[PDB]
Design a protein around this motif. Structure first.
Motif, PDB file in Angstrom:
ATOM      1  N   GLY A   1       0.941  -1.171  -0.068  1.00  0.00           N
ATOM      2  CA  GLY A   1      -0.084   0.054  -0.024  1.00  0.00           C
ATOM      3  C   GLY A   1       0.787   1.187   0.117  1.00  0.00           C
ATOM      4  O   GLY A   1       1.963   1.222   0.284  1.00  0.00           O
ATOM      5  N   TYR A   2       0.259   2.293  -0.211  1.00  0.00           N
ATOM      6  CA  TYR A   2       1.010   3.691  -0.084  1.00  0.00           C
ATOM      7  C   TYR A   2       0.962   4.128   1.321  1.00  0.00           C
ATOM      8  O   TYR A   2       0.063   3.818   2.019  1.00  0.00           O
ATOM      9  CB  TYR A   2       0.166   4.717  -1.175  1.00  0.00           C
ATOM     10  CG  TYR A   2       0.608   4.282  -2.631  1.00  0.00           C
ATOM     11  CD1 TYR A   2       1.787   4.496  -3.003  1.00  0.00           C
ATOM     12  CD2 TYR A   2      -0.684   3.843  -3.523  1.00  0.00           C
ATOM     13  CE1 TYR A   2       1.922   4.069  -4.476  1.00  0.00           C
ATOM     14  CE2 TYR A   2      -0.360   3.506  -4.457  1.00  0.00           C
ATOM     15  CZ  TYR A   2       0.946   3.507  -5.323  1.00  0.00           C
ATOM     16  OH  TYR A   2       0.854   3.363  -6.461  1.00  0.00           O
ATOM     17  N   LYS A   3       2.037   4.643   1.699  1.00  0.00           N
ATOM     18  CA  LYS A   3       1.990   5.428   2.970  1.00  0.00           C
ATOM     19  C   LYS A   3       1.435   6.756   2.734  1.00  0.00           C
ATOM     20  O   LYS A   3       1.215   7.205   1.694  1.00  0.00           O
ATOM     21  CB  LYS A   3       3.786   5.786   3.192  1.00  0.00           C
ATOM     22  CG  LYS A   3       4.550   4.783   3.285  1.00  0.00           C
ATOM     23  CD  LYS A   3       5.962   5.110   3.619  1.00  0.00           C
ATOM     24  CE  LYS A   3       6.768   3.686   3.758  1.00  0.00           C
ATOM     25  NZ  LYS A   3       7.201   2.831   2.521  1.00  0.00           N
TER      26      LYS A   3
ATOM     27  N   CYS B   1     -10.386  -0.444   5.177  1.00  0.00           N
ATOM     28  CA  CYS B   1      -9.858  -0.784   3.630  1.00  0.00           C
ATOM     29  C   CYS B   1      -9.512   0.668   3.185  1.00  0.00           C
ATOM     30  O   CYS B   1     -10.264   1.652   3.526  1.00  0.00           O
ATOM     31  CB  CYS B   1     -10.861  -1.030   2.596  1.00  0.00           C
ATOM     32  SG  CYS B   1     -11.739  -2.404   3.274  1.00  0.00           S
ATOM     33  N   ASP B   2      -8.079   0.959   2.732  1.00  0.00           N
ATOM     34  CA  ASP B   2      -7.710   2.341   2.215  1.00  0.00           C
ATOM     35  C   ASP B   2      -7.638   3.466   3.352  1.00  0.00           C
ATOM     36  O   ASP B   2      -7.726   4.345   3.137  1.00  0.00           O
ATOM     37  CB  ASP B   2      -8.538   2.788   1.059  1.00  0.00           C
ATOM     38  CG  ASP B   2      -7.409   3.831   0.293  1.00  0.00           C
ATOM     39  OD1 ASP B   2      -6.442   3.750   0.157  1.00  0.00           O
ATOM     40  OD2 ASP B   2      -8.229   4.716   0.002  1.00  0.00           O
ATOM     41  N   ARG B   3      -7.366   2.834   4.525  1.00  0.00           N
ATOM     42  CA  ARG B   3      -7.132   3.961   5.880  1.00  0.00           C
ATOM     43  C   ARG B   3      -5.747   4.341   5.617  1.00  0.00           C
ATOM     44  O   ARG B   3      -4.829   3.495   5.508  1.00  0.00           O
ATOM     45  CB  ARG B   3      -7.547   3.094   7.111  1.00  0.00           C
ATOM     46  CG  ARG B   3      -8.903   2.678   7.052  1.00  0.00           C
ATOM     47  CD  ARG B   3      -9.413   2.448   8.771  1.00  0.00           C
ATOM     48  NE  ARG B   3     -10.400   1.908   8.810  1.00  0.00           N
ATOM     49  CZ  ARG B   3     -10.771   1.314   9.885  1.00  0.00           C
ATOM     50  NH1 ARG B   3      -9.922   1.188  11.019  1.00  0.00           N
ATOM     51  NH2 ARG B   3     -11.924   0.909   9.881  1.00  0.00           N
ATOM     52  N   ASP B   4      -5.637   5.522   5.977  1.00  0.00           N
ATOM     53  CA  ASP B   4      -4.303   6.194   6.065  1.00  0.00           C
ATOM     54  C   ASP B   4      -3.347   5.547   7.017  1.00  0.00           C
ATOM     55  O   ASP B   4      -4.039   5.473   8.027  1.00  0.00           O
ATOM     56  CB  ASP B   4      -4.388   7.760   6.411  1.00  0.00           C
ATOM     57  CG  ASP B   4      -5.036   8.644   5.242  1.00  0.00           C
ATOM     58  OD1 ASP B   4      -4.633   7.961   4.056  1.00  0.00           O
ATOM     59  OD2 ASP B   4      -5.071   9.711   5.385  1.00  0.00           O
ATOM     60  N   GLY B   5      -2.256   5.307   6.763  1.00  0.00           N
ATOM     61  CA  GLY B   5      -1.234   4.531   7.872  1.00  0.00           C
ATOM     62  C   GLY B   5      -1.521   3.095   8.063  1.00  0.00           C
ATOM     63  O   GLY B   5      -1.042   2.272   9.001  1.00  0.00           O
ATOM     64  N   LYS B   6      -2.594   2.428   7.298  1.00  0.00           N
ATOM     65  CA  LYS B   6      -2.810   0.861   7.330  1.00  0.00           C
ATOM     66  C   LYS B   6      -2.415   0.437   5.920  1.00  0.00           C
ATOM     67  O   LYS B   6      -2.321   1.169   4.994  1.00  0.00           O
ATOM     68  CB  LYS B   6      -4.318   0.665   7.485  1.00  0.00           C
ATOM     69  CG  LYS B   6      -4.618   1.319   8.923  1.00  0.00           C
ATOM     70  CD  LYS B   6      -4.120   0.649  10.088  1.00  0.00           C
ATOM     71  CE  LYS B   6      -4.642   0.861  11.497  1.00  0.00           C
ATOM     72  NZ  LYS B   6      -4.434  -0.120  12.416  1.00  0.00           N
ATOM     73  N   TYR B   7      -2.272  -0.847   5.951  1.00  0.00           N
ATOM     74  CA  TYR B   7      -1.847  -1.548   4.749  1.00  0.00           C
ATOM     75  C   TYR B   7      -2.516  -2.922   4.493  1.00  0.00           C
ATOM     76  O   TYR B   7      -2.649  -3.520   5.475  1.00  0.00           O
ATOM     77  CB  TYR B   7      -0.250  -1.701   4.959  1.00  0.00           C
ATOM     78  CG  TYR B   7       0.515  -0.500   4.839  1.00  0.00           C
ATOM     79  CD1 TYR B   7       0.987   0.102   6.216  1.00  0.00           C
ATOM     80  CD2 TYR B   7       0.872   0.145   3.883  1.00  0.00           C
ATOM     81  CE1 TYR B   7       1.516   1.164   6.473  1.00  0.00           C
ATOM     82  CE2 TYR B   7       1.514   1.319   4.038  1.00  0.00           C
ATOM     83  CZ  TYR B   7       2.025   1.979   5.096  1.00  0.00           C
ATOM     84  OH  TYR B   7       2.488   3.023   5.480  1.00  0.00           O
ATOM     85  N   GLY B   8      -2.443  -3.290   3.042  1.00  0.00           N
ATOM     86  CA  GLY B   8      -3.270  -4.563   3.291  1.00  0.00           C
ATOM     87  C   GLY B   8      -2.266  -5.658   3.356  1.00  0.00           C
ATOM     88  O   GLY B   8      -1.100  -5.613   3.061  1.00  0.00           O
TER      89      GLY B   8
HETATM   90 NA    NA Z   1      -3.810   2.873   3.898  1.00  0.00          NA
END
Ligand code: NA
Ligand SMILES: N=C(N)c1cccc(C[C@H](NS(=O)(=O)c2cccc(-c3ccc(Cl)cc3Cl)c2)C(=O)N2CCC(CCN)CC2)c1
Ligand SMILES: *[C@@H]1O[C@H](CO)[C@@H](O)[C@H](O)[C@H]1NC(C)=O
Ligand code: NA
Lengths: 250, 11, 28
Positions: free
Chosen positions: A181-183, A223-230
């Motif tokens: 995921g993106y940072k 899903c797609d939360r800032d600072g989270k990753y799949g």
């Molecule tokens: Na994220």
């Protein structure tokens, strides 16, 4: 898939849809790795905390699909399951460690423009491609946000350094997982989401121009939360079990 | 929400 | 499984998809 886009026709011909018979609904994604074998996430089939325990006769696999809901006449193929194999050390109790399962089809599926198997990585290909910053691609018919897409969705995402993955969650992360995921700073976004589970994280080898499945969509916090990753099942690390299953029950 | 798949696939 | 990872409508015809270059460019 969140912040993805419509797949092109034939863009992901190994994409498999796991379909519940009754009631008729999407269960999970999956991938075609030969004419008789389909790879998915173990949790798509077995998850005791929510009383999920599917048997072969509960499910169908739909191969060659693009539209989420339409029956794609003359294009998709629907296969029945001969046998389900779940990783014997699949850890549903704690952190979905070894979230992997194989499905043997009752009969071989015919390949076509829309149906074609993905490669599984060898050690060198994994070593070469599984690096932080290197992007892979995720596909599925899952939720568009934390509502369901008309057609197969696709998104490209960068592999993330292991310490950043660990530091983003309270879940104990194992070597059988990697995250992507993106940072928050990086600007771009995108993630897998509910319904995408079991689908493939693929990369295209710049060495032989082949697509390799490095990962299986496993889990995420929202899903797609800032600072989270799949998080994704690390397919190479589990290849010995895959080979063993296919060697023994081929 | 899903279009019915052919009857042969349910049997 | 020996013809794996080569898409009939893409690699087989030497056609590229819209975003695969984004992958290649990340492979530094
Ligand atoms: Na994220
Ligand atoms: N964003 C992605 N890349 C992402 C990728 C895949 C799926 C989904 C949706 C969902 N996300 S969730 O936040 O809503 C959620 C809800 C309850 C528990 C957990 C959870 C389960 C196990 C572990 Cl180790 C960690 C966690 Cl956080 C997570 C989720 O991860 N799953 C996996 C387990 C499945 C159970 C089988 N039906 C339910 C759907 C998202
Ligand atoms: C899951 O499925 C099989 C057959 O339905 C069963 O007999 C086993 O005990 C079930 N439950 C699990 C693994 O929790
Ligand atoms: Na942590």
């Amino acid at each position: 898939i969140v912040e993805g886009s419509d797949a092109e026709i034939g863009m992901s011909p190994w994409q498999v849809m796991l379909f519940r018979k009754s009631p008729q609904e999407l269960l999970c994604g999956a991938s075609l790795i030969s004419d008789r074998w389909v790879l998915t996430a173990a949790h798509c089939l077995l998850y005791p905390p929510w009383d999920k325990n599917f048997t072969e006769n509960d499910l169908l696999v739909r191969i060659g699909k693009h539209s989420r809901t339409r029956y794609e006449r003359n294009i998709e193929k629907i296969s029945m399951l001969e046998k389900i194999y779940i990783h014997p050390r699949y850890n549903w109790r704690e952190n979905l460690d070894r979230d992997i399962a194989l499905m043997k089809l009752k009969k071989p599926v015919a390949f076509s423009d829309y149906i074609h198997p993905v490669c599984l990585p060898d050690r060198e290909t994994a070593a070469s491609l599984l690096q932080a910053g290197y992007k892979g691609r995720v596909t599925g018919w899952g939720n568009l946000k934390e509502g369901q897409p008309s057609v197969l969705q696709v998104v490209n995402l960068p592999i993330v350094e292991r310490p950043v993955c660990k530091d983003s969650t309270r879940i104990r992360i194992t070597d059988n997982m990697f995250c992507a995921g993106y940072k928050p700073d990086e600007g771009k976004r995108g993630d897998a989401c509910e319904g995408d589970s079991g689908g493939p994280f693929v990369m295209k080898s710049p060495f032989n121009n082949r697509w390799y499945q490095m990962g299986i969509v496993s889990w995420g916090e929202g899903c797609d939360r800032d600072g989270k990753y799949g998080f994704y099942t690390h397919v190479f690390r589990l290849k010995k079990w895959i080979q063993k299953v296919i060697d023994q029950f081929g | 929400d899903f279009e019915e798949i052919p009857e042969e696939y349910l049997q | 499984e020996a013809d794996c990872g080569l898409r009939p409508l893409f690699e087989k015809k030497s056609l590229e998809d819209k975003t695969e270059r984004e992958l290649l460019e990340s492979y530094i």
